[PDB]
Amino acid sequence: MQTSLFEFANVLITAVKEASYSISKFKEEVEIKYKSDGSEVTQVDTQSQQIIFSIIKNKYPTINIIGEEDVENGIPDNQLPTITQLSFGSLENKIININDIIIYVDPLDGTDCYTHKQYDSVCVLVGVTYKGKPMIGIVSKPFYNNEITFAIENYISSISLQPLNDKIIFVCSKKNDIQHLIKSFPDPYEVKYKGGSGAKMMAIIHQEADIYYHPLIQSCTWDTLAAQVILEAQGGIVCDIYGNPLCYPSSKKESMRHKKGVLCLSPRAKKYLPYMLSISKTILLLQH
Ligand SMILES: [Mg+2]
Ligand SMILES: [Mg+2]
Numbered sequence: 001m002q003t004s005l006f007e008f009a010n011v012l013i014t015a016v017k018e019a020s021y022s023i024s025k026f027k028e029e030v031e032i033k034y035k036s037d038g039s040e041v042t043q044v045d046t047q048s049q050q051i052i053f054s055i056i057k058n059k060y061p062t063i064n065i066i067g068e069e070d071v072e073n074g075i076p077d078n079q080l081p082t083i084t085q086l087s088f089g090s091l092e093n094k095i096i097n098i099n100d101i102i103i104y105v106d107p108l109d110g111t112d113c114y115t116h117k118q119y120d121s122v123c124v125l126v127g128v129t130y131k132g133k134p135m136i137g138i139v140s141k142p143f144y145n146n147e148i149t150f151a152i153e154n155y156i157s158s159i160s161l162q163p164l165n166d167k168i169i170f171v172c173s174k175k176n177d178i179q180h181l182i183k184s185f186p187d188p189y190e191v192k193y194k195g196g197s198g199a200k201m202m203a204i205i206h207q208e209a210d211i212y213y214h215p216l217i218q219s220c221t222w223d224t225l226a227a228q229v230i231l232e233a234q235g236g237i238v239c240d241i242y243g244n245p246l247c248y249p250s251s252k253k254e255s256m257r258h259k260k261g262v263l264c265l266s267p268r269a270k271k272y273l274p275y276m277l278s279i280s281k282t283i284l285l286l287q288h
């Protein structure tokens with residue numbers, strides 16, 4: 001029924017490292033399955049997910065864990081790396097209840113970025129809730145030396161920050177080019193185009209960007225939670241396009257889409273929330 005936070009964080013970090021390493025070291029020909037809604041999936045996505053699931057469930061067989069892809073655990077204990085024994089500075093090592101935990105996984109965010117050699121946009125995302133409340137976020141960028149960024153509540157791992165721009169930077173994909181939606185923005189600003197939803201949140205975390213405005217029902221729980229915990233630990237904001245907290249259902253039977261969109265603000269961009277809320281105020285998002 002219970003475990004320590006340090007144990008738990010070590011298991012998750014071990015899983016993410018191993019998955020990231022699997023992705024970055026992979027030279028065989030990729031085979032692209034197409035889901036029944038056109039979206040891509042490769043054996044690299046699924047193998048990454050199995051690694052993550054197997055490592056975690058081998059320690060915590062009861063644990064609630066939700067992943068983008070349709071695979072679970074299975075990889076036998078003796079092919080899995082041993083668990084790291086890291087300590088975490090002044091962070092307090094809590095006893096926690098396994099059944100209060102829910103884990104949300106994207107084994108490979110930017111599957112299309114991957115298949116198009118946009119390797120810089122590929123992330124592994126693992127986020128955790130505890131009693132419904134976001135608690136841990138772990139992000140890896142396999143093609144950026146398997147760099148891992150993570151946060152546990154208000155504590156945050158080492159992170160390189162680009163010198164602040166001074167112009168406010170909006171970041172979006174070309175396909176969701178919101179530049180016309182924000183022409184009335186009060187202060188000087190720029191639009192940077194970046195594929196990958198994980199990548200776009202990381203851009204804010206590394207101060208390459210300030211605002212990620214996603215007034216669309218394209219994001220899922222696993223796309224946001226990991227980066228959310230980190231950005232929030234930095235003092236940034238993640239919410240609906242109407243300013244409310246993102247929802248994280250407890251089961252994959254329920255829809256994992258963020259149906260009221262996504263909005264992320266850098267610490268300094270928090271003052272622009274009212275502006276963004278008045279922009280979103282007349283939008284009714286519809287799904288199909
Ligand atoms: Mg997909
Ligand atoms: Mg994915």
Ligand SMILES: [Mg+2]
Nearest residue numbers: 106109110223
């Ligand atoms: Mg994704």
